[PDB]
Amino acid sequence: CFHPPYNNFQPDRRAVKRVGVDTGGGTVGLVASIYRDSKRKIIRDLQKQDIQYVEYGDTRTLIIPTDKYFMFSSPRLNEICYPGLNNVIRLLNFYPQSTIYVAGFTDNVGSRSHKRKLSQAQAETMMTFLWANGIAAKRLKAEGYGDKNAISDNAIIHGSAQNRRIEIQWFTS
Amino acid sequence: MKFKKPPINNPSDDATIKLAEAAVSVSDSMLEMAKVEKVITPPSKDNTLTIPNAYNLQARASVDWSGPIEELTARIAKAAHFRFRVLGKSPSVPVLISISTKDESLAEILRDIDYQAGKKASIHVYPNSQVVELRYAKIY
Amino acid sequence: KFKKPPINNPSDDATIKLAEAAVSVSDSMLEMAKVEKVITPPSKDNTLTIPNAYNLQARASVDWSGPIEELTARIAKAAHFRFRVLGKSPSVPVLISISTKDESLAEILRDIDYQAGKKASIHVYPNSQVVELRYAK
Amino acid sequence: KETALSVGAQAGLAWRAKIIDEQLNKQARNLDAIYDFNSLVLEHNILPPVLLEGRNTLNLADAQSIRISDRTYKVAKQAHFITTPPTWRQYLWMDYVKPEAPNVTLLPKTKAEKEIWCIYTERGWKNGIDQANTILEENIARIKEDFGGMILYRKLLAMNMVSPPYVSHTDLGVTGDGSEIHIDDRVLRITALPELNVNSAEWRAAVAK
Amino acid sequence: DGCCSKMGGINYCDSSAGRLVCNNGFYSTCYCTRHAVMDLQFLMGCCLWHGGVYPQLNSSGLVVCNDGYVSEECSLQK
Amino acid sequence: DGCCSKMGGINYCDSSAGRLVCNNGFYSTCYCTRHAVMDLQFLMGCCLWHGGVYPQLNSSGLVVCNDGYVSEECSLQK
Amino acid sequence: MYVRTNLTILSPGWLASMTSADGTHAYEMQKSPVLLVSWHGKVMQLKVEGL
Amino acid sequence: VPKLPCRVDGACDATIIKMMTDLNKKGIKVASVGQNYLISIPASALFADQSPRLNWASYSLLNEIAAFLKQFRKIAITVTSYSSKYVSVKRERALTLARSRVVSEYLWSQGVDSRIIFTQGLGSDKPITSYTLGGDRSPNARVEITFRRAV
Amino acid sequence: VPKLPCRVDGACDATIIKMMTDLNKKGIKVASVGQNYLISIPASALFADQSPRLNWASYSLLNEIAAFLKQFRKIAITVTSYSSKYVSVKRERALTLARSRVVSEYLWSQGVDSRIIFTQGLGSDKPITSYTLGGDRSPNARVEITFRRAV
């Protein structure tokens, strides 16, 4: 049926499951499947998850909370919030030609070299997972920055919480 | 069509907030102090030379110890099948070690233990002799 | 099916910041110990080596706290070795306290020398079965 | 009335103290990990002293009279011996005692008395909360100050602007009468206390890369 | 009441910021601790900008501030 | 409350072990003397990490520890 | 206060300590209703009453 | 409570959400990331074609955005103007500068609680899309305001 | 006395016996002597075909075994791995080492209060049965946990 650990890197077959369980109707199964695979529904699902999506003209960006989709203070990943990653792959399938930039970001506290190394490691892990999902290697660039340029204050608790993040940018042409 | 910033954690506590706020400053100050002293004092030798690694020292270990030294080193020697040897006598004041690590190498664990012990004790190894020597410091 | 998360995981902002600070202070203190620590190379560690003589492989148990002369002479008597000195004893004798339940003569002598330190040394001639104490000048 | 105020204040203070102590117990290991003291003790089991530094001070004595200073240094606590490294319990742990005293005889009579009792208890609860938080703030400030003084002394000793302490040790052989004997008398006394050097040539600067 | 309306509601009070945090990922507009920046620009309390109100009790209705200045307007009339 | 429940039953309390013995030769869960190994973290009372509570009482409700430190949280407040 | 054990007292700070030939420790220190011992690498507290 | 303020004057998160939704339905872009807010307005709906003039209807939208921005506490706000490529470089540079000047002047006239206002124009130097068939109707021609909600 | 704990928290002898019986009847080997306890688990019910990637369904078994482990006040725990001869010696030695590392990491993540955990894997260097026909199905290829109860 399905494997929670990334379905062994195989493309999802969920529409067949739904149409089968609905026939067991075909029409309602098909309409529900197309409704859920509609990009609007995927965006709503991502919004339901703790994941941010920004669209500006053609350039489009994704924001990921490291603490929620990562293992604490380590290049490992959480193995519970994998539905978000599956949705990420499903969405990214829609733009199979645009190049991708990905970056990692931490807070201010710590050694400069330490923070830069950790950011680079996390970004590299993310891009490696994306490539292993099936994306062409020539369309990826990865980078890890420390506190070089934050998006909020590092002198307050929730601000520092928002500071550490994963950023994804992609064009269209 | 609601809006939401990503980070949503469990509710926090004011005491924890204050503790972390103190801790960051303390860590930064001590970090720059360490940088300054490293700059002013040149490093010469590495304890790896004194205690090199060898075969069968690779079985991994995850530890959490906050007591004296002898029990820990005896357990390590028992695991490593190496002969424990002691030189010198411990002073009246015990030498206390606190270690919070996980899943690393035996050789580096022992080197870190020696580093934390510092100028009170030292650890030596003889692989051909498969012995671990724990020497105290003769002082005062 | 169920892979439970870490139990005492830092699921709070203050907790994660505190843990990161703990990592930082650990690293900094480790560096401090590294830089301030002083070691001697194993090439020039002037300590007595194991004589590896067959007559020194026995086991015993001795708890002595006093001069070195009587203890070393008795050890030589047990090992069937002649024993002599070189130098002169000071006014206040050198005091050594070693206790063991099971130990061999080689490491016993090595520990004796290590306790003695700069004040005295011990040499072993296995070709001519003798042990010589050497005072400092 | 004010009796309800006082008992509610007591209840709130006790509850907050219990909560904060429980939180401190739960988050323990990292605390001792960061607040080491053994890695700070000196050579002879001598606790390093405590120092304070001030920057850019000013005092207007009166009209016509002003005195400014760039930097100043104070020896807060003189160094002294020690047998066991300090921990954080004697700086942050709170006294907890459940007040089970039913010293209440102004029992409610009407709804108005019941609700004024309720509001008095509420403000007492809040007052206990703020009291506990203030005590915690003072404690954490004090322990931070002590640790800062320790690290300041370490830094300045590294910079070679203060005199390191000096201890002299003497040794004596067997001693005692025919009924009491000691094997090895070893007497150690700190002859030279730590202090600063008001000299100038002895100053070596530091610059990183 | 609940300032975090039209959102998830109150999550917790950031004491360092002195602000409530809504369940929605945003900072609330209300407060929880007095140590916050509110642009207060008017207040009462006479003998102001001086030694304050002298704690002495006097037979006369005039009140003198601790700096020696007197606030007759704060005091009674005749 | 059965310490050796679903077992051989209570055999005896070893004081040197500070533990109960089940009839089947497996160490029990309960304790039987204060001279045992219990994980102790939470404590009651006040003037902790000090000279304890001073036995002498004062007319004022303040309580001061025997090392000279005063515990406001232990003293009742105005 | 005098105490006799084989553990390692930590918190209050003992004024004097004596060691037997079998690792038994006898400590002498100032009065305090609580003790702290690192037993086997694990921190532990000891309750003292009747002071 | 009667003395200590409990809320910042004229604050209502419900109103904030309402007007954010209304603005985005009107099509003017509102974006928030961390402690930062960026609002983008198309040039066609505000200014005259290739000229710095103001339609009388536009002042309703200006009043709306002023009332919105009045809700927050800030330090500095930055305004940038972008347009298409029409004749030269200095042409649209000056046009953007004048448009930013006018909008900043009106906003400052409005009782905006702000300390610093910065105004800049660039023209058609960093367009958001390669497709540039439209002129002032092209979406790249726009005005942007950026600021940070401070504490 | 009244507030002093009656027993060690999170411990019930009936629960211990019940879950030990459950594990033994499910086939996971539990052995007791004095106060030294040993547990054996066939590698087939844990890993893939000679791969250091634990099967997803085995997480319930790991949860159960950790839940059993939580009732014992312990100091040191040893986890070792045995395998079959597949290609070389170093291959399966590294495989066993990785498997032991992973299981040790998961246990350390779980709340099993110890002081020391040792982990190692020695491939097929400690055979216990002449039958070596199967591969990962062979009984000797397995994992084992040893510890000694304290006090």
TrEMBL record, chain A:
Residues 57-173 form the OmpA-like domain. Keywords: Membrane, Transmembrane, Transmembrane helix. GO terms for cellular component: membrane. The chain holds residues 42 to 236 of 249 of the full protein. It comes from the Bacteria. The keyword Transmembrane applies. Coiled coil: none annotated. The lineage of its organism: Bacteria, Pseudomonadati, Pseudomonadota, Gammaproteobacteria, Legionellales. This is Outer membrane protein, OmpA family protein.
Automatic annotation (TrEMBL), chain B:
It comes from the Bacteria. Gene3D superfamilies: DotD protein. Keywords: Lipoprotein, Signal. The keyword Signal applies. This is DotD. It comes from Legionella pneumophila.
UniProtKB/TrEMBL annotation, chain D:
It comes from the Bacteria. Keywords: Signal. This is DotC. It comes from Legionella pneumophila.
From TrEMBL, chains H, I:
One of its GO terms (cellular component) is membrane. It comes from the Bacteria. Residues 34-151 form the OmpA-like domain. Keywords: Membrane. The keyword Signal does not apply. The keyword Membrane applies. This is LphA (DotK). The chain holds residues 38 to 188 of 189 of the full protein.
